[PDB]
From a paper:
RNA polymerases (RNAPs) are the engines of transcription and an important target for the regulation of gene expression relevant for health and disease. We have applied single particle cryo-electron microscopy (cryo-EM) to characterise the structural bases of [name] inhibition in archaea. Here, we present the high-resolution structures of the inhibitors [name] and TFS4 in complex with the 13-subunit [name] from [name].
The structure of [name] confirms this close relationship, as both [name] and ORF131 adopt a highly superimposable coil bundle structure with six α-helices and a rmsd of 1.7 Å. We could resolve [name] encompassing residues 10–127 (of 145 aa) within the [name]–[name] complex, and the secondary structure content of [name] is in good agreement with CD-spectra recorded with free [name] which predicted a predominantly alpha-helical structure. The C-terminal tail of [name] forms an intricate network of interactions with the [name] clamp and rudder motifs with an interface area of 1127 Å2 that includes both hydrogen bonds and hydrophobic interactions. The [name] tail makes a 90° bend at residue N117 and the region L114–M119 adopts an unusual L-shaped conformation that fits into a pocket between rudder and clamp. The insertion of three additional residues, L99–D100–T101, allows the α6* helix to fold partially back on α5, and project the C-terminal tail inside the DNA-binding channel of [name].
Residue numbers in the entry:
A (entry chain C): 1 to 393
B (entry chain K): 2 to 86
C (entry chain Q): 39 to 81
D (entry chain F): 2 to 28
E (entry chain B): 785 to 817, 829 to 1017, 1022 to 1121
F (entry chain H): 9 to 84
G (entry chain B): 148 to 196
H (entry chain N): 1 to 66
Write the structure that this text describes.
C-alpha cells in the first residue's frame, strides 16, 4: 500500500545509500520495505529505517587485530563435546549405516583418503527422474554384485576335477542378470582350457585340462567366486529414494568417474561423501565447497548452530596450498615456518634435530613460540602501537 | 579498491576506535599513572580512587594526548588522535 | 620435474621484477607467454 | 632503549674545548 | 613453638588441639651416609584434636606409634549431598528456621529441592519415596519399596495419609516465612532419605600465593599452583589480551633474566666481583645484553645445548626503532 | 568431459596482467602469498590457466551473494 | 572375605576373563589373506600358552 | 548413635520420649497409638523416634581407652 | 584407619526395601531422613543444588 | 632410564608440562555454589581467599589515604595488607611489623602495598576443560562468608557449569596492564553474545523461565503490597503508576510490573515458546497469550518463555534488546528483571507432585487398546514373514524389511500413546508448564513419564544380545514379538517389569561411555584446529592474512562482519529494523 | 648492557671446537663423589659446572643459586661415535657423495645449474627447494659412479638404529664411525649447501661426536629426599 | 605377602588385591562383591546373559563402564570338581 511518491522517495534514498552497504544487503533492505503493508509509512519512518540499517551494518563490522583464527578454531571445536553418534542411519533408510557426528568431523578435518562408510547421492536426469521403475533399473544396474552372492551353492569334486555352481531362481531374478551372461563372463575370464556343461537348470559345471595341483584348483575356485558380474567397482548397494517429485539413488560406495560414465545420470548434480575424489576430478574450489557443506551438514544433524563464517575459514585454510591438506602434523600444522611451535605441537625431538642439521633459523613471527619465550604476541592488543607527546598535557 | 566491502571497512574504521586500541590506551595510561604521572582530569569529585578507573575516565573525556598510528599492510600509515578538542 | 621448479623460479623472478617497475605490463606478459610456451613444449 | 649512532661526526676542537666546558659549567 | 604440645616421651597427649603443622611424634634419625629431624608434621591445611595415641612393639622389635586425630565437620555451603536415587548436589545456602516456608502445622523443610530437577531426570522414585516416608512417619507402619513388589501400594498409602490428617497427594498448605503470606499453591512435603558424601569443601580448596618453586624448572609447586595449560592459553589468545598472557605465563611463573653474548649468542653470566659481563665462549672481550625470558626457555636452551644442537639466540632492539 | 557446469564448481576466470598488478599493489603482497591453485587442476585446465597467472573465482555465498577470491597458478 | 596384610585389609577382586582350554572361532579381518581364526588358550600348571 | 536431644526440623525435645516409646513398642503395641498418646503429632518428630538405631548400645563395648 | 568418617546421628531409612535388613544396613546406617519440600524457595537450589 | 631426550618428550615434559602450560601463582581452585544475588559480572570469594591472594596496587598520591587504611588493618583483618614494598625494593611482612600505624604514616608515593582482594577487583575465572573463548572470563570480586566460590546462575551456560561439586579456577592478575586488559576486554557483560553464533549465551535458566512465564500470564493480578515485595529485590525506585485494574479492587497485572523495566522505545512481535504446537494461531489475535506483542516498551500481549528471555536463543526479545541498547543495559535488565522473576516464583509457589503426571484410568485403557492394536499388527507382520507372503521394500532384503516395518509400527505406537496422554492430561500442570515453556523439559520426557517408555534400542537396533535366538531366558526360542526385544509398554509412573527394566538399562548403557570417549576426541580435535589456525589475524584492510604474511581471505566472511555482532547469521536483520521503526503502529 | 628482545634463534650443530671452548673444565675422573661425601674435582658432579645448594658460591662465576646459569663441561671420546639423532642425515650424506673425493655424484654443469636454481629459490619457495633437494639426492643415489673420480661406488645400507653396511666385493662391512667422519669431512661446503644444509652453521663431520658436552649441574640437580639417601639424576 | 601388599601379581595381571574400602557398610560390601573384566564397545554393552548374575545398574561411569560389575544377589561362582569323575559317568552313561 506504498504510495507512488513514497516508492519514488524510497528508490531515491536507496540509490543514494547504495555505496555504503553490500549489494545483497541493499537488495534485502529494498525487498523488505516494499513488503511492508497494513501500516502507514511516512518520510521520517523511511529515513529512520535506512539510517538504522546502515548504522547496524557499520556496528556489525569486525575489528582489526582480532585473533579470528583462535576464535574460529574454538567455535568449531567446542561443539565436539556436544556432538554425539545418536543417529546411525541415513535419512529414512534404516538399512544404510552412515557415520555422522564427531568421528565424521574428525575424518573431514584429517583429510582421510577414504571415509568411513562412504556414500553418494546420484540425481537422475530429466528422462529417468519421474518414473520409479527406470530409477530402480538404473540403481540395480550398478551394484557390483559378485558371483559369490548370486550362487546358492558351490561344490568341488576331485576325481572329476569339477566345480558345480548352483543358483537360486529368485536370487538370480533379484540381481536381474541371466545365467547365460554369467557363463559368458566366466568364459571371458579364460584363465585356462575349460569345459562347461549345462547340468541342471540354474546351475552348471566346469572342468579343466591343465588344472595341476588341487591347491591351484581351490585358488581357481576362490578366483571364480570373487568375480564381478555387473556394476561398477566400489559400490556395495544402491537404493532408490524419494526427495519430492524426483527420485534419487543413495549409494553405499564412492566412485565419481564410474558413475559419471553411467548413461542416464547427469554429471552436473552428483554428491559424494568423500572430498578427495571430487578434488581429483572437480578441482580444489569444488573440494573446498564440499568440505564446507559437509561440515555444515555434520553440525546440522546434531541440531546445534555454528556460524557459516567459521566453517568457510576452516575450509579456506584446508585448501590454501592447492590441495586438501591435513590440519595435523602432516599439513598446515606441519608447515608453520617455525621450529619451536612445530616441536611444541607434538612432543618430538626429531624436528629440533632436523632444524639444527639444516641450519634453519626461527623468525619468531608467530604466536605459539612468542608465548614460550615470553615476548608479547601480535594479536589484538599487540597489533596496536601508541605514540604519546607528554609536553602539552 | 580491492573490493567494495574492503572500502566500506576502511572508511568505517577511520573515525572509530577498536576495543583493542581502547584497551591498550587504558592500560598504558594506567601504567603511567601508577609510576607517578599526573592525571589530567580533576582528581577530586571521583567516586573511584583506582588508577584504571581514572585512566578510563580520561579516555572518555579525551584529555590524554595519545596518537595511534596504524600501519596498513600496503605501507600506508594512519594517525588517529584522541584529544577530541 | 625440474622443469616445473625452474618455471616457478622464472615466474617469481619475473613477478619480482615487475613489482620493482623495471618494465611495463605488456613486456612482462610476453615474457610469461614465452616461458610458458618454451617449457610446456618440453613437457 | 639506548641505541647510539654517530652521523657526520666532527673533531673535538682543542682551542674551543675550554669554551665548550665553560658553557657546560654555565649550564 | 611447634613442639609446645609434645609430651616428654615424644608423642602428643590425647585430647589436645592440633593446629597447622604441629608435631605429633618427635623422632630423630642418624644419617645413612649429626641427628636429623624425621618428626611428623600435621598437614598444614588439616586442623583437629588428637583422638587416640597407641604404642606397640612390631614383630622385628621396633617401636610403633600411631596417633589418630579427629576433626569436626559441620555441613556448610558447598558440601555435597545425595539421595538414594542419583540426585547429587552441593548445598546452595543454609537458611534459618524463621526464613524457611512453614506449613499450617509449623513443620519446616530440612532440605528444599528444585522441582526442575525432576522432569528431565525422570526420577519418579524420588516423589514416591517422599510420599512413602510421609506415610511411614504418620501411620508408623513399615514401608516396603522392593522393586516389582511394594507394600503397601501408592493408593492405600495416600488414603491412609488422608486418614491420619494430611493431604492425600502429600502436598500441604505452606506460608512464606519471611513475609508471613500464604503461597498461592500447595507445596509437596516428604521425608526422602539423604546421605552426606565425603567430598566436603573443607578439604577441596587449593589456593597459592607467592611460594616455593622447583629446583630444576623454577616453577611453583608445593601449596602448589594451578596449571594454566594450552587450552587456557588459547582462551587468553582468543580474547586478544597480550599483557595478560605475559602476566599469567611469564611474570607469575619462572620469570628470569639471562645475559646473552652479542656475537655467538650463547648465554653468559654476570660476575658479582667485577661489574663486567662474562661470556662462556668469548671470555671478557664481548658485550652481553640482558634479556627477560621464562626460565623454562633457558632450561630448554641448555638441554638442547647438552645435545649437539647449538641454539644461537639473536638479540634485537626492545624499542620499535623505525 | 566438461566439469565447469557442476554445481560445486564456482566461476573461474583468468584476469589480465594489469588487473593482477593493481591487485598485488593494493594488497601489498608478493603474488605467491595469495592462496595458490595447481596448474593441473581440471578447473584451471578448462580455462587454460598458465603458471604465474592469477585466477579470479566468484563463489556463491549467502552473506554477499557473490564473493570474489584470487588464486595463484603454480607449477604442478 | 579379606586378608589382613601388614595391618591393612586387602581383598582380592574377582577377575573375569575368557575361558581357558576352550576354542573360540571368529571371522578374520576383512581385506586380508586370513578368512577364519580360532584361538585356544591352554592354562597349564604355572604357564599359559 | 544416641537419640538427638531435639527434633532436627522443629526444636522439640524427643530424647526423653525414646525410652517410653521404645519400651512400649517392644512390648507389643503399634507405634502409631504410642506416638499419638506420647505427645508427638508432627511427623517430623515421628521420623525422629521411628527411625532410630541406638548404636550407642553396641559402641560401649568398643570404646577408645583414652 | 588412615581415613575414617563418622556420622553422629545416622538414621535407618523410613522407606526400606527387603534387602536392607538382610545386609545389616539399618544397623549401620549412612544417612538421615530429611523433611523434603519440592519447591523453588529462593533460587539457591538451581542447577542440581 | 630417562635421558635428556625423554625429559622434553611425552606428557609432563618440558614442551607441554613447562613451556606450553606451566603452574602459576595467585591462583585458587574451589567448589562452586549458586548465588542469584550477585551481578552477572561478579564472583563471590571466601574471606580466606581474599586474605591470602593479594594485589600490588602501587601507591600514588590519589589513593594514599585509602592505602593507609589497608596498612592499619593487618594481614588478618579484611580489608588489609599482607606486604609492603619500599621504592628501594625491600619487601616487608606486615605480620612481623612492630607497629603498623607508624609504618602506615611513613608510606608515600612509590610504595607498593600487597593487599587483600577488595570488592570490585577483577579476577579471571574459568572451568575446565576451557573449550571455547568465553570459558575464561573476568569477574568482579565480592567477598562473602563461607568457603566456596559463588557464581551467578546466569553465568552457568558460558562455563557449562552445574553444581554437582565440580570446582572452578580463579586467577588474580597482578600487573596494572593485565588488570586493565582484563577489565576492558574480558568483562562478563561485554561477552553476553557468544562468538559461535549471533545469540546470547547468558540468559534465563530453567527456573527463570518458569518464573517469567507465571508472572506474564494474562490471568495474574498483583496487589500493591505484592508488587512492592516483588520490586524490592530489584534496584528500582519510581512511581508505580495507576494499577491496571482500578475497580473493584486495585490490581497490578504482571505485564504492567514487567513493563516498568523495558526501554520506552522497544517494539517486538515474536511468538512465545508455548506456541510451538496445535495451540499456536500464528497471529496476535490468539486468545491464548502465546504471541508476544510489545509496543513502545509495554508488554501488551504474550508471555515470557525460552524464546523471549532464554539463553542460547538467537533472535529473541532479550537478544534484540541487548543488541540495540548495549551490554550494560543487558546486564542491568538481567539482574533486576530476573531477580523479580525469581521473587514472584518464590511468592506464588512452584512444586512437583504425582497428580500432574498421573493419567486417568480411561487414558490408560485407551493406551492399552492402542498397544494391543500395535502388537496385533506386528504379529501379523511376523506371520506374513514366516508364511513367506511378506512383500519386501524394493532394494532391501526380507529381514531388513520386516525390521523396518516393526520399528516404524512401534515408533508410531509410541507417538500416538504420547499424544493420547498429553490430550488426557491437565491443560496446565507444573510438569506441563516446565515442558511447554522450555524450562527443563521435553515432549518425549512427558511421554515416557506418563504414556509409555517405548522401544529401547542399543546401537540403533532392538535388543539382540543374549542366548541363541533369545535376548533373554524369560522368552520362547526364536521370539520376535515386540515385548521380547526391548519394547517397554510401561511408563515410569506405572513402573517397569523386570525384563522391561533390564532392557531399559541395556538401552541406556551406551551414554556412560560415549560421553567419556567424546570428551577426549573433541579435545584432541580442538587442539589440532587451534594449533593450525592460531596465526590468523584480521588486518586494517579487511584481509585475514596470517602473521607470516600469507593471505587467507581478501575479506573476512565476505562482508567483514564478526559473528558476535551479527544478528544470528545475518549482518543486519532488515525485518528487525522495520520492527524497531514502525512496530508501535504495526 | 641494555635490555633487548629476542628476534630469533639460529639452530646449528655444535662443533667440537665450540664444545671445547665453551666448557669450563675437562672431565677425566670416573668417580662422582669421595668417601667422605665431598664432591671430587674433575668428576661428573664438579662444583665448577654449577651450584644447586642455596648459599654456595660458584667457583666459575661467584654467583649464588640464583644468578648462576650453569656452566658446561666436556669429555673427549677416544674414538668418535655417531650421534643417533642425526643418523638419517649422516645416511643422506654417505650415499650422496663418493668416499674418494666427497663431491656430489653429479655432472659439474648440472651441479652448477642446480646450485644456481637452489640459491635463487632456497628462501622464496621452501617447499619447491626441498623438492629440488630430494630430486638431487635421488639422482645422486641412483648414480653409482663418481663423474669426478670414476671410482666404483658401493651401496650403503642402514640397519636400525645406527649400523652402516657397505657392499665391498661380495660382502658387507661395518663402516667405522672414524671412516664415516673422514668421508663427511672430505665433503666441500658448496655441496653441503646444495643438499639443503647450511655449511657454516652445520658441518657433516660435526654430526660424528668427537667431544661430548657435559650438562651443568643446574639442569640435572641431585635431589636428596629427607627420608632417603642422596639420589642422582639419570643423566 | 609381597603379592598381597603391592597388588602386582605373578601372572602379569595388575591390581589383584586392593585395600578394602570402608567409607561405610555399602562400600565395603560392594568392594567385596566386585568382578573386574580383564579386557571394546561390544564388551561394555549389557548382555542378556547377565540376567541374574551381574547387576545391570552398578557400573562405573567413564572408561570402566561395563567392565567393572557387581555380583548379583543370587549369583554363585562355581567351585569346580575333578574332570575324571564326570568323564567316567559320561562314558558309563
Ligand atoms: Mg557440576
Ligand atoms: Zn660470546
Ligand atoms: Zn519435630
Ligand atoms: Zn492459542
Ligand atoms: Zn656459576
Ligand atoms: Zn669423487
Amino acid at each position: 500500500m506504498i504510495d507512488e511518491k513514497l516508492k519514488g522517495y524510497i528508490d531515491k534514498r536507496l540509490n543514494e545509500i547504495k555505496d555504503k552497504i553490500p549489494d545483497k544487503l541493499h537488495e534485502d533492505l529494498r525487498a523488505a520495505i516494499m513488503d511492508i503493508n497494513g501500516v502507514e509509512l511516512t518520510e521520517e519512518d523511511i529515513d529512520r529505517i535506512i539510517d538504522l540499517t546502515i548504522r547496524e551494518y557499520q556496528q556489525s563490522l569486525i575489528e582489526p587485530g582480532e585473533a579470528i583464527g583462535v576464535v574460529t578454531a574454538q567455535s568449531v571445536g567446542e561443539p565436539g563435546t556436544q556432538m554425539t553418534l545418536r543417529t546411525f542411519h541415513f535419512a529414512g533408510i534404516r538399512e544404510l549405516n552412515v557415520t555422522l557426528g564427531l568421528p565424521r568431523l574428525i575424518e573431514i578435518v584429517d583429510a582421510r583418503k577414504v571415509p568411513s562408510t562412504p556414500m553418494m547421492t546420484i540425481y537422475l536426469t530429466d528422462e529417468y527422474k519421474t518414473d520409479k521403475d527406470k530409477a530402480l533399473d538404473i540403481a540395480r544396474r550398478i551394484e557390483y554384485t559378485r558371483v559369490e552372492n548370486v550362487v546358492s551353492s558351490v561344490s568341488v569334486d576331485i576325481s572329476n576335477m569339477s566345480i558345480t555352481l548352483q543358483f537360486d531362481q529368485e536370487m538370480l531374478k533379484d540381481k536381474g542378470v541371466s545365467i547365460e551372461e554369467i557363463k559368458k563372463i566366466i568364459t571371458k575370464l579364460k584363465l585356462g582350457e575349460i569345459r562347461i556343461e549345462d547340468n541342471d537348470e540354474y546351475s552348471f559345471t566346469i572342468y579343466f585340462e591343465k588344472i595341476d595341483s588341487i591347491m591351484a584348483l581351490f585358488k581357481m575356485r576362490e578366483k571364480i567366486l570373487n568375480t564381478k558380474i555387473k556394476g561398477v567397482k566400489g559400490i556395495k548397494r544402491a537404493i532408490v529414494q524419494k526427495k519430492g517429485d524426483e527420485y534419487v539413488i543413495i549409494t553405499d560406495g564412492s566412485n565419481l568417474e564410474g558413475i559419471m560414465n553411467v548413461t542416464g545420470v547427469d554429471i552436473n548434480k552428483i554428491q559424494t561423501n568423500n572430498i578427495h575424489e571430487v578434488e581429483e576430478v572437480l578441482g580444489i574450489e569444488a573440494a573446498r565447497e564440499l568440505i564446507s557443506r559437509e561440515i555444515k551438514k555434520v553440525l546440522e544433524e546434531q541440531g546445534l548452530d555454528v556460524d557459516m563464517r567459521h566453517i568457510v575459514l576452516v575450509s579456506d585454510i584446508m585448501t590454501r596450498t592447492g590441495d586438501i591438506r591435513q590440519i595435523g602434523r602432516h599439513g598446515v600444522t606441519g608447515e608453520k615456518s617455525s621450529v619451536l611451535a612445530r616441536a611444541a605441537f607434538e612432543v618430538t625431538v626429531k624436528h629440533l634435530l632436523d632444524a639444527a642439521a639444516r641450519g634453519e633459523r626461527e623468525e619468531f613471527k608467530g604466536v605459539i613460540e612468542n608465548i614460550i619465550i615470553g615476548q608479547p604476541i601480535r594479536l589484538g592488543t599487540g597489533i596496536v602501537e601508541l605514540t604519546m607527546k607528554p609536553n602539552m598535557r | 579498491t580491492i573490493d567494495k566491502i574492503n572500502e566500506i571497512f576502511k572508511e568505517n574504521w577511520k573515525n572509530k576506535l577498536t576495543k583493542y586500541e581502547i584497551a591498550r590506551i587504558i592500560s598504558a595510561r594506567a601504567l603511567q599513572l601508577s609510576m607517578g604521572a599526573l592525571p589530567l582530569i580533576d582528581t577530586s569529585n571521583l567516586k573511584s580512587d583506582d588508577v584504571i578507573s581514572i585512566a578510563e575516565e580520561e579516555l572518555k573525556r579525551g584529555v590524554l594526548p595519545i596518537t595511534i598510528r596504524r600501519i596498513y599492510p600496503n605501507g600506508q600509515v594512519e594517525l588517529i588522535s584522541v584529544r577530541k578538542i | 620435474t625440474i622443469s616445473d621448479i625452474e618455471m616457478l623460479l622464472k615466474d617469481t623472478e619475473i613477478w619480482d621484477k615487475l613489482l620493482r617497475n623495471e618494465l611495463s605490463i605488456e613486456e612482462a606478459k610476453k615474457m610469461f607467454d614465452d616461458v610458458a610456451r618454451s617449457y610446456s613444449k618440453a613437457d | 632503549s639506548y641505541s647510539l649512532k654517530t652521523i657526520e661526526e666532527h673533531f673535538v676542537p682543542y682551542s674551543i674545548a675550554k669554551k665548550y666546558i665553560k658553557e657546560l659549567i654555565d649550564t | 613453638d611447634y613442639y609446645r604440645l609434645l609430651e616428654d616421651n615424644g608423642v602428643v597427649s590425647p585430647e589436645v588441639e592440633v593446629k597447622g603443622g604441629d608435631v605429633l611424634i618427635g623422632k630423630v634419625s642418624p644419617p645413612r651416609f649429626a641427628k636429623r629431624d624425621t618428626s611428623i608434621v600435621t598437614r598444614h591445611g588439616e586442623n583437629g584434636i588428637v583422638d587416640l595415641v597407641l604404642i606397640t612393639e612390631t614383630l622385628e622389635g621396633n617401636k610403633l606409634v600411631k596417633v589418630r586425630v579427629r576433626d569436626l565437620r559441620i555441613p556448610e555451603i558447598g558440601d555435597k549431598f545425595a539421595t538414594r536415587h542419583g540426585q547429587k548436589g552441593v548445598v546452595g545456602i543454609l537458611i534459618d528456621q524463621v526464613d524457611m516456608p512453614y506449613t499450617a502445622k509449623g513443620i519446616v523443610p530440612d532440605i528444599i529441592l528444585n522441582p526442575h530437577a525432576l522432569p528431565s531426570r525422570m526420577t519418579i522414585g524420588q516423589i514416591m519415596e517422599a510420599i512413602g516416608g510421609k506415610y511411614a512417619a504418620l501411620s508408623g507402619k513399615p514401608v516396603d519399596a522392593t522393586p516389582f513388589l511394594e507394600t503397601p501400594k501408592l493408593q492405600e498409602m495416600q488414603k491412609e495419609i488422608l486418614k491420619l490428617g494430611h493431604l492425600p497427594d502429600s502436598t500441604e498448605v505452606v506460608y512464606d516465612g519471611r513475609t508471613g503470606q500464604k503461597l498461592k499453591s500447595r507445596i509437596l512435603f516428604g521425608i526422602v532419605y539423604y546421605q552426606k558424601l565425603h567430598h566436603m569443601v573443607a578439604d577441596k580448596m587449593h589456593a597459592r600465593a607467592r611460594g616455593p618453586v622447583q629446583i630444576l624448572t623454577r616453577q611453583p609447586t608445593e601449596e602448589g599452583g594451578l596449571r594454566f595449560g594450552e587450552m587456557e592459553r588459547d582462551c587468553l589468545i582468543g580474547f586478544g589480551t597480550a599483557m595478560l598472557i605475559k602476566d599469567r605465563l611469564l611474570d607469575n611463573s619462572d620469570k628470569a633474566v639471562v645475559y646473552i653474548c652479542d656475537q655467538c649468542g650463547y648465554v653468559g653470566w654476570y660476575d658479582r666481583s667485577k661489574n663486567r659481563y662474562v661470556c662462556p665462549v668469548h671470555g671478557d672481550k664481548s658485550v652481553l645484553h640482558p634479556v627477560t625470558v621464562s626460565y623454562a626457555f633457558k632450561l630448554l636452551i641448555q638441554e638442547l645445548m647438552s645435545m649437539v644442537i647449538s641454539p644461537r639466540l639473536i638479540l634485537g632492539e626492545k624499542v620499535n626503532l623505525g | 568431459i566438461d566439469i565447469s557446469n557442476h554445481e560445486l564448481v564456482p566461476k573461474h576466470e583468468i584476469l589480465q596482467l594489469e588487473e593482477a598488478y593493481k591487485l598485488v599493489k593494493e594488497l601489498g603482497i608478493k603474488p605467491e602469498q595469495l592462496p595458490w591453485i595447481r596448474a593441473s587442476d581440471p578447473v584451471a585446465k578448462s580455462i587454460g590457466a598458465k603458471p604465474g597467472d592469477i585466477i579470479k573465482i566468484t563463489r556463491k555465498s549467502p552473506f554477499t551473494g557473490e564473493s570474489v577470491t584470487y588464486r595463484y597458478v603454480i607449477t604442478g | 572375605g579379606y586378608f589382613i596384610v601388614n595391618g591393612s585389609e586387602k581383598v582380592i577382586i574377582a577377575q573375569e576373563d575368557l575361558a581357558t582350554n576352550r576354542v573360540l572361532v571368529d571371522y578374520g579381518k576383512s581385506g586380508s589373506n586370513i578368512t577364519h581364526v580360532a584361538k585356544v588358550t591352554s592354562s597349564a600348571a604355572g604357564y599359559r600358552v | 548413635m544416641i537419640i538427638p536431644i531435639r527434633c532436627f526440623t522443629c526444636g522439640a525435645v524427643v530424647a526423653d520420649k525414646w525410652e517410653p516409646f521404645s519400651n512400649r513398642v517392644m512390648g507389643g503395641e503399634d507405634p502409631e497409638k504410642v506416638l499419638t498418646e506420647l505427645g508427638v503429632n508432627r511427623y517430623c518428630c515421628r521420623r525422629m523416634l521411628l527411625s532410630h538405631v541406638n548404636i550407642i548400645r553396641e559402641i560401649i563395648h568398643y570404646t577408645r581407652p583414652i | 584407619d588412615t581415613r575414617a568418617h563418622l556420622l553422629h546421628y545416622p538414621q535407618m531409612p523410613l522407606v526400606q526395601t527387603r534387602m536392607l535388613g538382610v545386609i545389616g544396613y539399618n544397623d549401620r546406617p549412612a544417612g538421615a531422613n530429611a523433611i523434603l519440600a519440592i519447591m523453588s524457595y529462593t533460587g539457591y537450589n538451581m542447577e542440581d543444588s | 632410564l630417562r635421558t635428556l631426550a625423554q625429559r622434553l618428550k611425552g606428557k609432563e615434559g618440558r614442551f607441554r608440562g613447562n613451556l606450553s602450560g606451566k603452574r602459576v601463582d595467585f591462583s585458587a581452585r574451589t567448589v562452586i555454589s549458586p548465588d542469584p544475588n550477585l551481578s552477572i559480572d561478579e564472583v563471590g570469594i571466601p574471606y580466606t581467599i581474599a586474605r591470602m591472594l593479594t594485589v600490588p596496587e602501587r601507591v600514588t598520591n590519589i589513593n594514599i589515604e585509602r592505602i593507609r587504611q589497608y596498612i592499619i588493618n593487618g594481614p588478618d583483618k579484611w580489608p588489609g595488607a599482607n606486604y609492603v614494598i619500599k621504592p628501594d625494593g625491600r619487601r616487608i611482612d606486615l605480620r612481623y611489623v612492630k607497629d603498623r600505624k607508624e609504618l602506615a604514616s611513613s608510606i608515600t608515593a612509590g610504595y607498593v602495598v600487597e593487599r587483600h582482594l577488595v570488592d570490585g577487583d577483577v579476577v579471571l575465572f574459568n572451568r575446565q576443560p576451557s573449550l571455547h573463548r568465553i570459558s575464561m572470563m573476568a569477574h568482579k570480586v565480592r567477598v562473602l562468608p563461607g568457603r566456596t566460590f559463588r557464581l551467578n546462575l546466569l553465568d552457568c551456560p558460558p562455563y557449562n557449569a552445574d553444581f554437582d561439586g565440580d570446582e572452578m579456577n580463579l586467577h588474580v592478575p597482578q600487573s596494572e596492564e593485565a588488570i586493565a586488559e582484563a577489565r576492558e576486554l574480558m568483562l562478563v557483560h561485554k561477552n553476553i553474545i557468544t562468538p559461535r553464533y549471533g545469540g546470547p549465551i547468558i540468559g534465563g535458566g530453567q527456573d527463570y523461565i518458569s518464573g517469567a512465564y507465571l508472572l506474564s500470564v494474562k490471568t495474574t493480578l498483583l496487589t500493591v503490597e505484592e508488587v512492592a515485595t516483588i520490586l524490592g529485590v530489584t534496584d528500582f525506585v519510581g512511581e508505580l503508576g495507576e494499577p491496571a485494574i482500578l475497580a473493584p479492587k486495585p490490581y497490578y497485572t504482571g505485564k504492567q510490573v514487567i513493563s516498568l523495566f523495558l526501554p520506552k522505545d522497544f517494539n517486538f512481535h515474536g511468538p512465545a515458546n508455548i506456541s510451538k504446537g496445535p495451540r499456536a494461531c500464528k497471529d496476535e489475535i490468539c486468545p491464548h497469550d502465546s504471541f508476544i506483542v510489545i509496543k513502545n516498551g509495554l508488554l501488551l500481549e504474550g508471555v515470557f518463555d525460552k524464546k523471549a528471555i532464554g539463553n542460547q536463543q538467537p533472535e529473541s526479545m532479550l537478544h534484540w534488546s541487548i543488541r540495540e541498547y548495549g551490554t550494560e543495559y543487558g546486564k542491568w535488565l538481567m539482574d533486576n528483571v530476573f531477580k523479580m522473576f525469581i521473587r514472584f516464583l518464590e511468592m506464588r509457589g512452584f512444586t512437583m507432585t504425582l497428580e500432574d503426571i498421573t493419567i486417568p484410568d480411561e487414558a490408560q485403557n485407551e493406551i492399552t487398546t492402542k498397544i494391543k492394536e500395535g502388537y496385533s499388527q506386528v504379529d501379523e507382520y511376523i506371520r506374513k514373514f514366516n508364511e513367506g507372503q511378506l512383500e519386501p521394500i524394493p532394494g532391501r532384503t526380507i529381514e531388513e524389511s520386516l525390521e523396518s516395518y516393526i520399528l516404524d509400527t512401534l515408533d508410531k505406537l509410541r507417538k500416538v500413546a504420547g499424544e493420547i496422554a498429553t490430550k488426557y492430561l491437565d491443560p496446565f500442570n507444573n510438569v506441563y508448564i516446565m515442558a511447554i515453556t522450555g524450562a527443563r523439559g521435553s515432549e518425549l520426557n512427558i511421554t515416557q513419564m506418563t504414556a509409555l517408555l517405548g522401544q529401547q534400542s542399543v546401537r540403533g537396533e532392538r535388543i539382540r544380545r543374549g542366548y541363541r535366538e533369545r535376548t533373554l531366558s524369560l522368552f520362547k526360542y526364536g521370539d520376535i514379538a515386540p515385548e521380547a526385544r526391548g519394547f517397554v509398554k510401561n511408563s515410569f509412573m506405572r513402573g517397569l517389569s523386570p525384563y522391561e527394566m533390564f532392557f531399559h538399562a541395556a538401552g541406556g548403557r551406551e551414554g556412560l561411555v560415549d560421553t567419556a570417549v567424546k570428551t577426549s576426541q573433541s579435545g584432541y580435535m580442538q587442539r589440532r584446529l587451534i594449533n593450525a589456525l592460531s596465526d590468523l589475524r584480521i588486518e586494517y584492510d579487511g584481509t585475514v592474512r596470517s602473521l607470516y604474511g600469507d593471505i587467507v581471505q581478501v575479506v573476512y566472511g565476505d562482508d567483514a562482519v564478526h559473528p558476535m555482532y551479527s544478528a544470528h547469521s545475518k549482518s543486519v536483520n532488515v525485518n528487525r529494523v522495520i520492527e524497531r521503526v514502525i512496530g508501535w503502529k504495526r | 648492557m641494555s635490555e633487548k628482545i629476542i628476534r630469533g634463534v639460529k639452530f646449528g650443530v655444535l662443533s667440537p671446537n665450540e664444545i671445547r671452548q665453551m666448557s669450563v673444565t675437562a672431565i677425566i675422573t670416573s668417580e662422582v663423589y669421595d668417601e667422605d661425601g665431598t664432591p671430587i674435582e674433575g668428576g661428573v658432579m664438579d662444583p665448577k659446572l654449577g651450584v644447586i645448594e642455596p648459599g654456595q658460591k660458584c667457583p666459575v662465576c661467584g654467583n649464588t643459586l640464583a644468578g648462576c646459569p650453569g656452566h658446561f663441561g666436556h669429555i673427549e671420546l677416544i674414538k668418535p661415535v655417531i650421534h643417533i639423532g642425526y643418523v638419517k642425515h649422516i645416511y643422506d650424506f654417505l650415499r650422496s657423495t663418493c668416499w674418494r673425493c666427497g663431491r656430489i655424484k653429479i655432472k659439474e654443469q648440472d651441479l652448477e645449474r642446480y646450485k644456481r636454481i637452489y640459491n635463487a629459490i632456497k628462501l622464496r619457495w621452501p617447499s619447491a627447494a626441498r623438492r629440488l633437494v630430494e630430486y638431487i639426492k635421488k639422482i645422486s643415489i641412483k648414480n653409482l659412479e663418481c663423474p669426478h673420480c670414476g671410482e666404483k661406488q658401493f651401496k650403503i645400507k642402514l640397519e636400525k638404529p645406527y649400523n652402516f653396511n657397505e657392499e665391498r666385493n661380495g660382502s658387507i662391512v661395518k663402516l667405522s664411525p672414524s671412516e664415516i667422519r673422514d668421508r663427511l669431512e672430505r665433503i666441500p661446503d658448496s655441496d653441503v649447501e646444495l643438499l639443503g644444509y647450511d655449511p657454516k652453521s652445520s658441518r657433516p663431520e660435526w654430526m660424528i661426536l668427537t667431544v661430548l658436552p657435559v650438562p651443568p649441574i643446574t639442569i640435572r640437580p641431585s635431589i636428596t629426599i629427607e627420608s632417603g639417601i642422596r639420589a642422582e639424576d639419570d643423566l | 605377602r609381597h603379592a598381597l601388599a603391592t597388588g602386582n601379581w605373578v601372572g602379569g595381571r595388575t591390581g589383584v588385591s586392593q585395600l578394602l574400602d570402608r567409607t561405610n557398610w555399602l562400600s565395603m560390601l560392594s568392594h567385596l562383591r566386585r568382578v573386574v573384566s580383564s579386557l571394546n564397545f561390544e564388551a561394555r554393552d549389557l548382555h542378556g546373559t547377565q540376567w541374574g548374575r551381574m547387576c545391570p545398574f552398578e557400573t562405573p561411569e567413564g572408561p570402566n563402564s561395563g567392565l567393572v560389575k557387581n555380583l548379583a544377589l543370587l549369583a554363585q561362582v562355581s567351585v569346580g570338581i575333578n574332570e575324571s569323575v564326570v568323564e567316567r559317568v559320561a562314558y558309563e552313561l
